[PDB]
Design a binder for these strands. Structure first.
Lengths: 84, 50
DNA sequence: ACTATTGCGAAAAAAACATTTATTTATAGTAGCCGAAAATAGTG
DNA sequence: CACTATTTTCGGCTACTATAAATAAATGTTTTTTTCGCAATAGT
């Protein structure tokens, strides 16, 4: 049950990326999701709580806007970070 | 009398009542730990099993 | 109530001092995320 | 009996600490201490 649910966890994290491409305190605590903990789900390894993440692989549509600003300026990371 | 209802009646029947009933009655008197900082945080004791 | 005397409480700060900023080798080792392909099983 | 679809099966890849050893202005915090404020308390 935990192994099959693990693939669903990254499944929500794929659609977050492509969409980006395009007393009173307890009331909302009741409105939050209620879930049972199974000890296999939260399991941690060496790959946990660390720097870095999975970069989006680049596209050919990004290449033509990359190579053109690469050609105009020498090498300027600053303004091209705002381009993407 | 002594066959079904022994001679260590006092220590058996008192402690065995403590295990079943009274242990639920303690956590229901100290449920819902709370903090002032982060007021939307809570932890609650729902049941007890030994 | 309100003002004063009190203790602590929090924060500066000081001095130190290890923790970050960009290089280059790889090398083997994880570890995550992604197809690439391939067989297998439902079902036509 | 055989197509179609799928769940594997298998790399493929991309990253990513490390390492030292510089340089260096931050760039964090720590203990240790000291400062400074407020509320704590009780008597105005």
């Amino acid at each position: 049950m935990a192994k099959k649910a693990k693939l669903e966890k990254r499944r929500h994290l794929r659609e977050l990326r492509m969409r980006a491409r395009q007393k009173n305190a307890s009331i909302e605590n009741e409105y939050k999701e209620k879930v049972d903990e199974n000890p296999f789900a939260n399991l941690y390894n060496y790959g946990s709580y660390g720097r870095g993440s999975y970069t989006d692989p680049w596209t050919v549509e990004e290449m033509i806007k990359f190579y053109k600003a690469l050609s105009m300026w020498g090498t300027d990371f600053n303004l091209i970070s705002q381009l993407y | 009398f002594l066959k079904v209802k022994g001679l260590v009646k006092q220590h058996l029947d008192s402690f065995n009542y403590f295990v079943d009933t009274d242990l639920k009655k303690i956590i229901k008197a100290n449920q819902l730990i709370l903090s002032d900082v982060d007021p939307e945080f809570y932890l609650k004791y729902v049941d007890i099993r030994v």
